[PDB]
Amino acid sequence: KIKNPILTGFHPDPSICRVGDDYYIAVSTFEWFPGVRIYHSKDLKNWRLVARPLNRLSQLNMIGNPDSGGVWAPHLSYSDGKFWLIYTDVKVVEGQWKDGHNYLVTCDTIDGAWSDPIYLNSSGFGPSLFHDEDGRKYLVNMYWDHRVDHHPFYGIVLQEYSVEQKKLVGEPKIIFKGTDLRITEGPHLYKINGYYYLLTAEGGTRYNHAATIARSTSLYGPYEVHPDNPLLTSWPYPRNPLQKAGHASIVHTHTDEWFLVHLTGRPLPREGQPLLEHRGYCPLGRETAIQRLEWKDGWPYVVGGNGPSLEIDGPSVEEVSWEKDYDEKDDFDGDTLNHHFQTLRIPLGEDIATLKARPGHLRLYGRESLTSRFTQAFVARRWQHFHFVAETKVSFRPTTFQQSAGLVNYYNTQNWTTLQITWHEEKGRILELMTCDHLVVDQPLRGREIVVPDDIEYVYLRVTVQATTYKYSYSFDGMNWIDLPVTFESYKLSDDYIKSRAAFTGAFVGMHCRDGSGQNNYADFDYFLYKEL
Amino acid sequence: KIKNPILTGFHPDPSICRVGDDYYIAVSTFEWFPGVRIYHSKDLKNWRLVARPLNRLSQLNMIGNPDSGGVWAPHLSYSDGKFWLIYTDVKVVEGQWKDGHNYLVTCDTIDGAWSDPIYLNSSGFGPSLFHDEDGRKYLVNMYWDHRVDHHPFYGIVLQEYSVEQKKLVGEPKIIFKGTDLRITEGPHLYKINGYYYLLTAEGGTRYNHAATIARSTSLYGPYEVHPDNPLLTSWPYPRNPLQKAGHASIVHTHTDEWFLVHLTGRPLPREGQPLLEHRGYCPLGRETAIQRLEWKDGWPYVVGGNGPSLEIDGPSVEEVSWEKDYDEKDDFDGDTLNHHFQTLRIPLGEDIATLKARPGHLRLYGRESLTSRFTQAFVARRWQHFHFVAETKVSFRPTTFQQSAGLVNYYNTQNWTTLQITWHEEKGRILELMTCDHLVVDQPLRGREIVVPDDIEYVYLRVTVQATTYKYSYSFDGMNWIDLPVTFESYKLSDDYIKSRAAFTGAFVGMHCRDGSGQNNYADFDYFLYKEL
Amino acid sequence: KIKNPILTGFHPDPSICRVGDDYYIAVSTFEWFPGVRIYHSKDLKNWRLVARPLNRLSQLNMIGNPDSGGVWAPHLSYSDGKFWLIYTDVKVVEGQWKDGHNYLVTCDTIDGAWSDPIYLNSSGFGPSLFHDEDGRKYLVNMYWDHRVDHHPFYGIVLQEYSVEQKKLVGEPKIIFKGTDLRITEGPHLYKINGYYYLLTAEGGTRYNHAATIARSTSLYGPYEVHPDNPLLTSWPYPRNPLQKAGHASIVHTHTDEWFLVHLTGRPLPREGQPLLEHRGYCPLGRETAIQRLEWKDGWPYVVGGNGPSLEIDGPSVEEVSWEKDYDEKDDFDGDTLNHHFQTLRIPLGEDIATLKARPGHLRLYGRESLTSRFTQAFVARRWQHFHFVAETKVSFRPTTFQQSAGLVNYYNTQNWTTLQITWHEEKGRILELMTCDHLVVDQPLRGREIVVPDDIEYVYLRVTVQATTYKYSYSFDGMNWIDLPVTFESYKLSDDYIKSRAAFTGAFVGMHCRDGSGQNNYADFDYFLYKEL
Ligand SMILES: O[C@@H]1[C@@H](O)[C@H](O[C@@H]2CO[C@@H](O)[C@H](O)[C@H]2O)OC[C@H]1O
Ligand SMILES: O[C@@H]1[C@@H](O)[C@H](O[C@@H]2CO[C@@H](O)[C@H](O)[C@H]2O)OC[C@H]1O
Ligand SMILES: O[C@@H]1[C@@H](O)[C@H](O[C@@H]2CO[C@@H](O)[C@H](O)[C@H]2O)OC[C@H]1O
Ligand SMILES: [Ca+2]
Ligand SMILES: [Ca+2]
């Protein structure tokens, strides 16, 4: 009844939460602002965005954060009449260290004003709050080992959280070291039948990703490993369209059914290439999928081998679909930008992004380059399909090559492409292509830039994505289009192409304005179109 | 009279200001907080630190700033009853862009409470404020060109600044493109005779560095170039112990004499090595020197040819020397940290660095690792000599390998070495060595670390610097010192060694505490000693 | 009167030899076969190729030699009624070692069958045979030090050679260590007035290259260095069209005049670039220039300062001009290949390259690819001008992608471009472009290759080089020519571009046939043209 993935495009580390017959999934958002995206469902098939909880500087201040830093795996839970959301702001993403900070916020409702943060600890990412049967509370996260000779995933640490004291109490204790996969992270605790079950992710979030499960009658263990571990993995199944299956969380429904949600990468078509040499490139980044579970000797079993199935059988409820929460052609009609739009690291005030300066237009005042981890006037949405068209219509008069405005396909500060309006000494105002690949810049139309006539109020910019390749086009009138003669490869905006390993997001497409001169020049965007093909 | 360098260790981009018979030099401080150092002198020979102007988050907020970002070359001038300070906060320091913002702050007195910044522009670094005879004021700076087919140093832009509107007005114009040396930056304007003189730095701040001067009778040029340009340079003088001479400023003394201050690097000793192949390694970074000028046919000339002289004739005024402004041995009985101490990027409040918690001690609560561009509990002072000892006494009780405290010699987040106390599963509380070289970490004393006796309150940590090499040693009593069996090389803590080439600072020595578990564990430093040998 | 360079394109390490009023210059040929080129002149201005001495496998066997190995600096002298030629076959060109063996061969005549080699030593490249007034003979070369903590240019070794025993005798002894420039190599000995003069190259063969001279009254030293040393250098003359001035040999004329020949690199036009940042790219490799000397206090001085002159006054002799020694349009009617043509490493027999199989054609039977250091059916001549056209007309019927024939511009196995005929599964016989940069291959006409009509017998292939760029073109009928829309960059075929720094040759243009299948397929080339402008 359900076809994976359920959440498409950048949607990793799903954290499922049941409130009655209501289902929530919280995913990680990394450098993209605001922090955490929460989807609500009635049937687990159809998903709707209902919260974006970390929207105040007091809660999440990400300026300067590295690419793929920020909000890693979040944990959503419900207890004592309120939602508990745990999250990390990760500061260092490369080297011996992984500096980052674990915080708790709460709210009586899903889409309310969530509290200011309570500081937990810093010992490692993956934080999860356990609500025990006796009313005591426990935080589990991974424990980080920076030392030269050592594997960094020291195992799972656990420490009591005092609600009243608003702090962890007692001494932290390692309760589990993982199996021989290692890279043990993403711990979740569950009290089921007579056991504590400890769910982890192991093998790392590339092609060796697994969900491991263990159990103990004592919270502190020692835990004993599933006899047929891993619970879920893609590593044995190179032909499965769903790779990387791991970082799971478990739901017990109101219909006495069991499911497992997990991230998964969907590689691009690599027909005619070696099966096991390189398992692929995922521009849609890590998406959220859902597996059916079943129990056998006090152990859950993913229905249909420990590999992910494409289509499963859902829970015994009536289907509930949702109205489309965005315009295919978004004319900038509201007084708030559509909630699929995110900014990099920080909220953009009306001094930078505003619907109030020119009616029915998003206006962007130019800030820093596409390479800045600080202040970019950039509003973007996820690539959410392999085949799509996206388009925009923009008014812009640059007086210098320090100014630009354009349509950008973007991975991170060092990996992106763009069709942009700029200015040139001889040619005046022009259109041009620009790419950045691991910080190396190319201008494919250098010497042959497109002269924009003076009488043109609006330049129309379009990208057409067709799985492995995409192309840009322009129009001066809305009617007559022209392809720019350059084919781009989507694999270059994918998790798997990034040489750092710190590549935890996915491709975005959006609207950018840069003013390197500091003259507060701006571009008026009449609309932004995103349409699946 | 005057031996160079006048400001030793890290003191780049000297901007010199005359007020009557008082003399001030401002130098750049990059990622080090607080922003900008100002020194005073009566005779151009003896110099004391009198101001650290950019000490409010509102003036300078460098959280996340890259290494060698932040405060680049500043400009100090005096006019209309007050001091004017111009500065850049540089956000991007690698690739095609150099995103960064120029700001003006003022004060009636050199060590007053300077204004909050007035925003000027963002078009390039090296901003300078010119006050013309007719009362009018003008900003000059370099203009950045990001384009792939282009040299980035597009020339010198000039624009009128309206004190009344508190903004640049009219239209920006390029007034100078440079000479074939290119890398034209650091513009300063001078009205002399019936001429505007434009001074620039050219050829880049490494071994081809130079200072170039031009003249015009129109503020907007064309400027004719000095007939024997460069005005100053070490490039053709590979044996001059003073290298990289350039980024200069001119001072016309009250006694009708002319001088020129500039940065320089002093390479480590190089015998046995090709004179020209690699011209050296500068652990003291770029330092400040002074040269006499003399005039011919409407042109200035560095007395003693166009290379820098080691020793010069001071101005015709009485010698005025200054009492020492730090203690060789700092016992931490002050109410504030000695002004030769600095922190990374941000101010540290009493929650991180405190002289109050335990009188006679500096307490550092553990924050992030030595590789973090965010929050480090780290207090440090410049290497200002080739030959030195530096030493500290600390009590620390780490309970996990995630915590540490030590003596660090530091270039940047990826380049440092430390003798630190930490914790190990079997040995308990230990002394270890740790190094980071372009992010790659080494533990040279593994697994052969010093065991600290449970009964020892303070560990005594020392480093002895001898030009090319340095050594770490320790005592449990202050009297019986044992060397650690590793010889270190000072060239690895120099501008010239860093692969990125955003390397514009110099070596520091200081005190660090890390707590990556998040338990607020601290270290108490009873004293810090630094002594020239 | 004499305009430099006198030998144009790849002509390094000139060894000049006088015999009455006959003048000879031998240069290095590295991996190009046959080994060594000797040019003759009566006037030092006009030069004609007269000998290629190392043309037998017994003399020079270079199969598998690495790029820029094989025949390094040669030495040509005349004594006791015959010619003496010292050479090196360098086997190792990267790492701590420079494995290579020095050899002596002799001939009564410049252009006869030279003798078989007498092995000499192996201690360092740059061998030179000196002939003392008292009829004794000594060998000088450089001494090679492979050790980690050591500069590899240990200085100059000297040793006597015995004509009767056919070998070196007595003890080897260091006579010279070098100046602070180091990289001491290319030693030559002269006996003049009271002194022996020892000339060397220092600073390395890039932009720091120098000629260094020293004197002693004793053959074994010690040697006092010239007081205004270097004798010759371009290093302080960044504006000089002739760069890398070094590796000289001295000639005393029959007119009692003195000159110095030297190598030199002429960078491509550099307008807009920083003067000193990178001093240039030389696709014509290292060329041979000549300078005039005068004497003063027992020391020779380069007339015109110690930098090289573009134009000099030649010796007071009658001009002797030489007729052009190749056809602009080589129709391949001759019995042997023009002597400007070389092969890689080895000679090619009639089973690979023949003018005999097809009258009026050069036939190449396809062997191994362009990346092979073993057997290539490749016949090539030097780039000798910054603007030229080269062109060929070829008949070729490939039956597999494994077979190619074409026109190649070639630096080494890992750096080259080509316009070539091959075969395609669906399109059949096609014309394509291929490039290789540091072993990375591109096909810029991927998917748009030119279909060759089956009815066409000859494909005409042309390259037009214009200084910084060049462009390929083709025709089927030889009147109407189509440019392939790809603009190539000459700097990618230059010494300076090559990453290994074992880059000692220069760019060639030639004809190539590959048969990767082993079917002995061949290409018939009707002509080869080369023309300046
Ligand atoms: O927050 C999530 C984490 O679960 C994941 O953790 C690891 C980071 O370091 C790398 O060594 C591993 O590949 C990876 O599993 O980071 C990704 C994020 O989604
Ligand atoms: O403030 C000074 C700058 O003026 C200087 O700017 C240049 C930045 O680009 C680099 O490629 C060059 O090396 C450098 O000249 O850098 C140093 C800083 O102190
Ligand atoms: O015959 C010449 C050599 O003597 C010379 O070799 C040196 C080899 O190492 C490089 O680092 C130096 O720059 C170079 O001088 O050049 C090669 C050959 O032409
Ligand atoms: Ca609209
Ligand atoms: Ca004290």
Ligand SMILES: [Ca+2]
């Ligand atoms: Ca012919």
